[PDB]
Amino acid sequence: IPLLEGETDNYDGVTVTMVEPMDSEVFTESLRASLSHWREEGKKGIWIKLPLGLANLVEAAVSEGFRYHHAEPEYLMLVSWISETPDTIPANASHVVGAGALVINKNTKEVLVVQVWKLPTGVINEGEDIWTGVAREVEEETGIIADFVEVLAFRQSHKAILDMFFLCVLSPRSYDITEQKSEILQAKWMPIQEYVDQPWNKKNEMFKFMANICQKKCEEEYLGFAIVPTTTSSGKESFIYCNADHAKRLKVSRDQAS
Amino acid sequence: QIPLLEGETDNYDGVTVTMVEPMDSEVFTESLRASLSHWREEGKKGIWIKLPLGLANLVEAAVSEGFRYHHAEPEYLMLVSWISETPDTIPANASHVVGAGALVINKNTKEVLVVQEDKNVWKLPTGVINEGEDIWTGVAREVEEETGIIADFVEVLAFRQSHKAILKKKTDMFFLCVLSPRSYDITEQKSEILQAKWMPIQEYVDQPWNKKNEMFKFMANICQKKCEEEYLGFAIVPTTTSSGKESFIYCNADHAKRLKVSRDQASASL
């Protein structure tokens, strides 16, 4: 009876990417055989990637002692330690990234707010850059276009019942908000002092600190992190967010001699 | 009779169902379809089903009714479905792998802790930051686990988003951090690294790979500048949010110093 196709690594593990439908009775028996031939071989650490359409398989896997590792929509990652060596299966090291947009009209010291008023926030997609992501959210929410300047602050949060947050400052290229930009979304330009003094004022130390940081950048006294564009070991893009002045110094220093 | 699943109601027109007892999958289907209908009428927007590992016989049933995976811990699967006509509000679980590097400076002779295990012979101590784990705690953990050295987090010098090995839409997240060492004695560790030593910053910088490609050249340059005590990064100031009370904001180190000064000098209100 046939084994499962497994792809190996130099951590002694194996990841089975389940791609085509299969009867559950067949899967458990084909898995039980595979578990036997993996304990004889390099034994420890087996991963089953189970896509949403193959949800008819998760019980079969779990019944065989697999547990959950992490999930995206359209795939579930399951894992098992099949060695008698101490279970050292690494926990998930992926995080959900969100971004907060501070869009400053530097001319009027005013900021773009949304539905009581808040900064436009969203999440950074898989494969998306923070600087790209934060701008898209502004455009999706208010219709206005704005370029990314700096990252003012970031934070983490949990107990997570339902994450990483980057506060970014954006520079607007347009000022007209469109009606109606989104369903149950509403927007206006607000003076910075009104935003800081808003009904939360002293609600908690965290919102108050983030607001004060927003204000210091509105007064042009806050040095955040700016981007230095670069490339990885492959041809692929990369961006270093570092001290704004050093970011300039590094970016400027890229020019041509006599 | 509507077989209605017990759920808890949030304030954003959502219901969370936590399944705790075994249920026949057919019965669950019937009960879930009924529930989804009542909720739709009741005005509910986001429906969350939390299925423990041992109740995995229900997973397919939930999925069949339009539920998709949201989050999984070893012991449970959290599933979501949006049942309202309005635009879907739930955050997608779009994740990035998160890493940290430790620049551990010996302030006496401008040396840093290095290990042999990116394509440098001697890299900084680096690892992944677990989901749920503070960067400032995780980077220090990696130091201890690899070298035995107890080191304190001072600043985030830089963070990096890369796109990955032609595979797909994926992007990395990596935090370079600077840490102050308590001891200078490297103990042999039950760890994947082959060896660690102290290495003069200049020799680390002048390594072929750090000289060869631009990205590591910039990271290495940042590290060298912080050794010259001329780099300002993002330091930490701790806060409390309302519902969970343990939180950290990484912000400009001079502002972090100012906010900490003002808060400490505000405790004097006695």
In DSSP notation, B12-26 reads SSEEEEE--S---HH
Distance of alpha carbon A52 from the chain centroid: 21
- On the question of a cis peptide bond just before residue A180, with omega within 30 degrees of 0, the verdict is yes
Backbone angles phi, psi at B155, to 5 degrees: -150, 155
Residue of A nearest to B130 (CA): A93
How many residues make up chain B in this entry? Answer: 270
Locus of tokens 């494969």:
A127
Q: Contact at 8 Å (CB) between A206 and B249?
A: yes
| CA–CA gap between residue B92 and residue B151 (Å, rounded) | 36
Residue B213, both tokens: 């490609």
The verdict on whether residue A72 carries a ligand-binding annotation is no
Answer yes or no: same fold for B8-82 and B98-227. no
| CA–CA gap between residue B266 and residue B256 (Å, rounded) | 15
To one decimal, the resolution in angstroms is: 2.6
Q: Hey, which residues 31-90 in chain A have their CB within 8 Å of chain B?
A: 52, 55-56, 58-59, 62-63, 67-77, 90
Separation in Å, CA A24 to CA A27, A32, A62, A81, B259: 5, 12, 12, 22, 59
| Adjacent-strand bridge partners of A223 | none
Fold observed for domain B8-82: Aminopeptidase (3.40.630)
Min Cα–Cα distance to chain A from B44, Å: 16
SS3 B178: strand
Q: How far apart are the first and last CA of chain B?
A: 62
| CA–CA gap between residue B41 and residue B39 (Å, rounded) | 5
Tell whether B261 lies on the interface with A, counting CB pairs under 8 A: no
Locus of tokens 């065989």:
A64
Domain boundaries, chain B: 8-82, 98-227, 234-267
Q: Hey, which residues 100-159 in chain B have their CB within 8 Å of chain A?
A: 118-119, 128-132, 134-135, 157-159
The structure's method of determination equals X-ray
- On the question of a cis peptide bond just before residue A181, with omega within 30 degrees of 0, the verdict is no
DSSP β-ladder status, A94-105 and A110-114? antiparallel
| CA–CA gap between residue A217 and residue A153 (Å, rounded) | 11
Q: Contact at 8 Å (CB) between B221 and A250?
A: yes
Residues sharing a CB contact under 8 Å with residue B214, sequence separation 6 or more, in sequence order: A230, A231
Nearest to B70 among A71, A127, A234 (CB): A71
Residues sharing a CB contact under 8 Å with residue B108, sequence separation 6 or more, in sequence order: none
Q: Would you give the DSSP letter of residue B168? A: S
- Contact flag B69-A74 (C-beta cutoff 8 Å): yes
Backbone angles phi, psi at B239, to 5 degrees: -145, 175
Locus of tokens 């500048």:
B225
| CA–CA gap between residue B45 and residue A183 (Å, rounded) | 14
Q: Contact at 8 Å (CB) between A171 and A203?
A: no
Tell whether A238 lies on the interface with B, counting CB pairs under 8 A: yes
Residue B85 burial class via C-beta count within 10 angstroms: exposed 0-12, middle 13-18, buried 19 and up? exposed
DSSP β-ladder status, B195-200 and B111-116? antiparallel
SS3 A115: coil
Q: Hey, which residues 187-216 in chain A have their CB within 8 Å of chain B?
A: 203-206, 209-210, 212-213, 216
The verdict on whether residue A141 carries a ligand-binding annotation is yes
Distance of alpha carbon A61 from the chain centroid: 29
Q: Would you give the DSSP letter of residue B130? A: P
**Residues of A with CB below 8 A from B159's CB?**
225, 240-241
Q: Contact at 8 Å (CB) between B236 and B138?
A: no
| CA–CA gap between residue B245 and residue A206 (Å, rounded) | 10
Q: How many CA atoms lie within 13 A of A103 on its CB side?
A: 30
Q: How far apart are the first and last CA of chain A?
A: 72
- Contact flag B242-A204 (C-beta cutoff 8 Å): yes
Q: CATH number for A97-218: choose from 3.30.70.890, 2.60.40.1730, 3.40.640.10, 3.90.79.10.
A: 3.90.79.10
Q: CATH number for A7-80: choose from 3.40.630.30, 1.10.3720.10, 3.40.50.2000, 3.40.50.620.
A: 3.40.630.30
| CA–CA gap between residue A257 and residue A239 (Å, rounded) | 25
Residues sharing a CB contact under 8 Å with residue B3, sequence separation 6 or more, in sequence order: B27, B30, B31, B34, B35
Could you confirm whether domain B98-227 is CATH 3.90.79.10? yes
Q: Would you give the DSSP letter of residue B171? A: B
Min Cα–Cα distance to chain B from A99, Å: 12
Q: Computed over its alpha carbons, how large is the radius of gyration of chain B?
A: 25
Residue of B nearest to A234 (CA): B165
Candidates B134, B234, B259, partner chain A, best to mutate (most A CBs within 10 A) = B234
Locus of tokens 């898209």:
A136
| CA–CA gap between residue A107 and residue A220 (Å, rounded) | 12
SS3 B270: coil
